A paper describes a structure:
Type 4 pili (T4P) are important virulence factors, which belong to a superfamily of nanomachines ubiquitous in prokaryotes, called type 4 filaments (T4F). [name] T4P have been characterised in depth, revealing that they are heteropolymers of two major pilins (PilE1, PilE2)—which is unusual—and three minor pilins (PilA, PilB, PilC).
As PilE1 and PilE2, which could not be distinguished within the final density map, share high sequence identity, we arbitrarily chose PilE1 to produce an atomic model of [name] T4P. In the globular head, α1C is packed against a three-strand β-sheet, which is flanked at its N- and C-termini by two regions with limited secondary structure elements, a large αβ-loop and a short CT tail, respectively. Critically, as in other structures of bacterial T4F11, a portion of α1N is melted, the extent of which varies slightly between Ile16 and Gln28 in the different chains. The filaments are right-handed with four pilins per turn, displaying approx. 11 Å rise and 93° twist between consecutive subunits within the 1-start helix.
Author numbering:
A (entry chain E): 16 to 92, 100 to 138
B (entry chain I), F (entry chain A), H (entry chain B): 1 to 92, 100 to 137
C (entry chain C): 1 to 92, 100 to 138
D (entry chain H): 2 to 92, 100 to 138
E (entry chain F): 1 to 91, 101 to 134
G (entry chain D): 10 to 92, 100 to 139
I (entry chain G): 1 to 54, 64 to 92, 100 to 137
The structure:
Amino acid sequence: IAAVAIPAITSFQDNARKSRIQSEHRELVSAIQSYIGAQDDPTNPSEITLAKLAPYMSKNAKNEDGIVNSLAKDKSGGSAHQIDTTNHKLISTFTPSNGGQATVLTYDWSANGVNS
Amino acid sequence: FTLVELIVVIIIIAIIAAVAIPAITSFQDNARKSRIQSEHRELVSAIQSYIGAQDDPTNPSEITLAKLAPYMSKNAKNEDGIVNSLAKDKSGGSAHQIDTTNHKLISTFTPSNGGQATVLTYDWSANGVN
Amino acid sequence: FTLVELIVVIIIIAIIAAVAIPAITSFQDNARKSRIQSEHRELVSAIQSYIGAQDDPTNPSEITLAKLAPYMSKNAKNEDGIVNSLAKDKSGGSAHQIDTTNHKLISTFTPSNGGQATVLTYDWSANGVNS
Amino acid sequence: TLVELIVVIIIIAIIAAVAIPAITSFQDNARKSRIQSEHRELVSAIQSYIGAQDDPTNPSEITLAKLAPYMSKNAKNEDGIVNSLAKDKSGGSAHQIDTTNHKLISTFTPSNGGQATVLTYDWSANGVNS
Amino acid sequence: FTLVELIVVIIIIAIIAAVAIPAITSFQDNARKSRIQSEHRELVSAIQSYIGAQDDPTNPSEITLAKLAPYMSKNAKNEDGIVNSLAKDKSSAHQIDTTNHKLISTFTPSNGGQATVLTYDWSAN
Amino acid sequence: FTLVELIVVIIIIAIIAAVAIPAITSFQDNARKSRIQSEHRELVSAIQSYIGAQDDPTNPSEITLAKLAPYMSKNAKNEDGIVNSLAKDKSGGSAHQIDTTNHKLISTFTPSNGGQATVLTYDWSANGVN
Amino acid sequence: IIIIAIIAAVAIPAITSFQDNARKSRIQSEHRELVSAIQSYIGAQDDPTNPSEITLAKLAPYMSKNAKNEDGIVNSLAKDKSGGSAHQIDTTNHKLISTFTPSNGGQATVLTYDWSANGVNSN
Amino acid sequence: FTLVELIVVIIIIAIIAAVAIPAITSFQDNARKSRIQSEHRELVSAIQSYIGAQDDPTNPSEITLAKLAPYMSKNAKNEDGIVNSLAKDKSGGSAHQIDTTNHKLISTFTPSNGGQATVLTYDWSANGVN
Amino acid sequence: FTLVELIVVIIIIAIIAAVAIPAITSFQDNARKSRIQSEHRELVSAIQSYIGAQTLAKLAPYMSKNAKNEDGIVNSLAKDKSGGSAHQIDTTNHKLISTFTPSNGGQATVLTYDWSANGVN
């Protein structure tokens, strides 16, 4: 009875965090769509940046004062989301604790498309 | 054996609930701007038809959007006349205006956030030259 | 995805559907009146040429637009009656008539709203000239 | 291990008691949005058809069977528009023509039995002066 | 559709509605310029015909459009004053000088450009 | 959780997304029908100006539209043959045809749904009147 | 220790039975976007009334890369797990077909769209 | 809530998030294409009128759009130069340009993805067909 | 409106703008043709009258001056496209010639008259 194995918590923890990042990314990808839809000339995208995308997203459950307190946090192998403002790309990263290979999501609105 | 399972549940329930929530009404406003800009060209088409149906198109008479009335299909329900149908813009009583004395049609729109106004003009005589 | 976005979809549709819609009917009367006047000039040219073809141009016999038939091509649908080529007066059907006993051609138009009518006159008798 | 085995029962008893939500939500009021756009669709079709015969001022008597070849088949490859326009109470199309009055009526009625809604279009009469 | 189609349908309108508007009355007045010339030709033929009326075609008398009126028909309105059946301009668009046997037609456009002149003489050349 | 997936994942998306689709073909017919007529009238004006140039306007030797070619300007993209400029209908490839035996010019059109045809004719023969 | 044999008796829900209503949804909502793409493309070329030889490899510029940044369109659409796109173009028929089959082997469902000579022609 | 239930909530999200995303820009430039095709036919109407209004229409002089300016109205912002009204393209920035010596009007359109260009052309100076 | 609706106007405009248009110059020179063929008979009647009265410079007083008071008939007679009078005389040949050349580079057309040696075989 003493020999029964005990599983580690971190294995279930990390694989849930991997779901959180993957949800928030898919919300930001339509928030930014609304911003480009509503900039004063929507036909010519201009200098999107995360701090100015803020008013489309609700406060955290503590009613704190900025979305860096709401969007998720990661090692980024610290904000789990970043904008490459001059290159017009959004990137979201999940880094495992165990040394497994990292997962990076991406979105890209500057006329690149699939080109294939 | 089960207690580890239960505390695992208690952790994951905590961390998946933190997901951020979008804000309602955020994009809603600029549809009205789209209505204004699409309805302006429709009034330009109407006024440019009336200007051709009068007897002396070389020397046109006055216009007001009351005389312009019989072109706008009565607003999808029992309603009296076109002022009931053209977009409202209470913050800036009718979105459409005619300077009946100086032959100028103007449409205007203004966000609530204090950004600068949108204005559109059409001016149907002796204009266009540099 | 989540509820809020799918609510704003409904709101945007409810707004965008409320653009006004233009009427079907406009500007028809001047189009009819223009064909009337241009066709009138063509009938005046036809009858003026016909007077030169009788055995004595100074004293022609009776003229009727049924006699004037061989000057006008068939209708574009290949129907052959001259009256099926000329415009219709929708007050009631040719908008053109000949006062055969008094040498006068008359082309009439009546506005669709019932306003004031307009008439064009021509005659080939000597009474067509004055000092 | 009897201590943890004891408290496992307590944790189960607590976790099982959570409030369980119910299914309905917007599934009613979303259908009204199908109606609002499918109406403007039929108005665009009928406003094309009314101009195709040789006299746009004396059109023939429209029935939606004559309008039908403007609509695509249902995605399930059904064979007629009544299997495509939104259904309503038996009375089953929410849209009908009553050609003797020259009007198209589109309808809605909520499950709570509240105030019903009507959208009307008319190709005979339109807004009066003033 | 989902939201993206509804932002595309807003983006598209802003660049359909911008198509430029052509003016009105840009080309109106040159129809007067043309019908002035055709009426000039017809009046020239009429005054030429007039020389055959009196007993001696080698010694014709004075002429005015009042004398010449018997040679062309009443108005399409069936009114009969030829001073309104001729073309009209800032001035009758046509003139006769009994003292020089000269017939003149003239047209001046509203844009302030150069005036245009036509002339005929049945007496000497 | 599961049910607030369920509703948006199935119910509301199924209700909102499956509105009826307009048919992309049937709206084209009036545009084709119009451009046919406009080209017909301009071809008549051209041939009616070709006859008046001949050395013997009582007997123009023959007319086929290759001879008529230089009276209309070359199309956009500069595909400089006349047949490249006129309307097409493989079921009529020109939609206009010249009969050299009967001196007759013909135009023809047919709606894609298999409706009744329309035909136009012009004829400069002595058989072409009354 | 006997109590553990009772505590262990709880039945396990089978994950496969919860998938169908999700895949069905991301077939329907994807089909409607491919149709909107086709219905735009058919108006872009120089002859609005004679189609080109449409195939989805030429629709490709109308929708984004995968989140994995793999390019090409076929990597992006939903997969028929029986075998690989769940969306097919039958070029000869001008017909688009989309297919779904439940894992337990129930009756199939197909969506369809067709952009030539395809008015209903009621009764 | 039990773990074997709680993980399917993860699975459903992992499926439903992975829809395709439509690319805005490829829909946008299909509209800019239809500006070019409309504005070109307006410039043809203007230049074909101006050749008719000159002092001797058989002997037209050089043309520039600056000379052509008064024939179409100034833009909705009451900006006062023709060049601001006409559409813009990277092949410029005006998409429309006139060859003063070869008497040719050229409109060019460049796809945003760097694909194959498209050009429209008109030529009033006696070039004709065949 | 929605895209399914909105793109059909793009279709319709793309169709309506394709209508062909007539060539201006191909009427205009076939008009000029008529003043050549007609004024040829005016010159013939004048010079035939002159040879009964007992180069076009000698003929000049026999015909009316232009409506804009040009200085002589050489400015009233029509203009040759080739290279300027479209009419010429040669008193070494007793011959009058008139010519028209089309703008397309197609077949040129020539009239002739002589006050001697009419008639054949």
